[PDB]
Amino acid sequence: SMCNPSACRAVGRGLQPKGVRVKETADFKVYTKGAGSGELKVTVKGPKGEERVKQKDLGDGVYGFEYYPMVPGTYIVTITWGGQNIGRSPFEVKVGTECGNQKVRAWGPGLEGGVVGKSADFVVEAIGDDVGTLGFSVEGPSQAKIECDDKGDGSCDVRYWQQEAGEYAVHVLCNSEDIRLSPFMADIRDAPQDFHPDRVKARGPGLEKTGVAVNKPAEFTVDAKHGGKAPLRVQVQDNEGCPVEALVKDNGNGTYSCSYVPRKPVKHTAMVSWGGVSIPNSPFRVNV
Template sequence: MLNCVYVDSPTDFVVDSRAIAKKDDGKVTCTITNPSGTKTENLITPQADGTYRISYTPFEEGRHTIDILYDGLPIPGSPFVVNVRRGCDPKKCRAFGPGLQKGIVEKANAFTVETKGAGTGGLGLSIEGPSEAKMTCKDNRDGSCSVEYIPTEPGEYDVSIRFADQHIPGSPFKVPVDKHVDASLVKAYGPGLEPSQCRTGSPLTFKVDASKSGKAPLDVKIRSERGALPQHPVIKDNGDGTYDVTYTPPPEGSTVKANIIWDGKEIPNRLGTFLDI
């Protein structure tokens, strides 16, 4: 009837009454008696297919007697005997939180591990990646623990979570780690931002260096007192955290302004953004 029932581990089984002629007052009842003689609460849930699902969580080790009645009469095989033992089931553990989705360099990245209902076993945590990452774990005294880790280099990290020396579902977790996104760390420089280099009709290029910030969208708006330029600037991603931006200046006598936006914020570290042509 039931296999591998553990102390403090939620479990369930199904009672199939579909072969019995339906009665308006027919119902399933269940009594679970523990080794000490006390009772364990259970939840009976009627299913759409005419069966009943009975759920309970044993809290004592040893022989449990399960009496199942339909319309006041024992069903065939009742009472059933189930031996509950202390054990472990890593599949009943789970881990979740933002620190398992992505991480930030030099920041405390957090996630939670729940072991409630998994039985008895030790919890093992490790992280491997481009750098050593300091990890701390706090027992919440409710079957869960809060974990934080601080990586020092960007890249992909493997976060391994084991219960009783076995990986829990999803472990090892592949976590991309990047630098903190900060527009104040982005700089722009080059001929395209120097008034002395600006000539009508001659394409100009300047560089945006975002290598010290985490990845984010780059937007560049170049306009004169007459409005936006007819052609949008061309942005080339160099793949190393830097970008080359090329644009064609407006007619002579114009004043050009470059707005360089990183992650929705205008960068403060730029040179020569007001160009007189």
């Protein structure tokens, strides 16, 4: 027909051994296209026995799943294609209690996705002023090379590099415990041919080191004519973890007229990724 479970992949935060906490949605996807004629079965076993599992057909042999852990402890996720375990099934998942006082937060394109052979980066900035020890590790189809530089500013930049497509688990640890939402599931894509995230320049008043005022429409342009075709993502937030609104007008030629309005003369951070990869100079730290 013929059944071939080795062509199946099971990825998602709901399958990671550590990091998931109670009252969180534990999500994961299963890829089955190309695995021949078969049958997918997903079971989640917790300390309370059977766990409810919501399934959603994502098209093209991809199926999304969500279970909702309520009590800490060990959960087992069994994923089978024609009676044979898929990938690393069964998955042992240790669900923790509600996270305590967060001393640090993390955001950036490298926590959500990236491109093969390209740098996947994010930033980890301090909450308050109680200093500790930050830990980083990345698990996936290949061993990523991690680099992070303490900046004293309280926000230190983190980068990891790989050369294999797939989903990676990025762990940010504060005093040897996964911070909230850690591990972060990054979807690393294979590089399009014409796509050059390098050379995607973003100039403008809204991105300069100085010169941005509060309640002013701080604009900037993202010229990307020789960068292939790939989605543009603009994300802005202040010194706290609070996002502020961005507006991205596709001007139709390959350039973009981007706008965001700050609402505090406090330092904002504007991240511009092209095809899931930080363009040069991003993260833009703007003294608004």
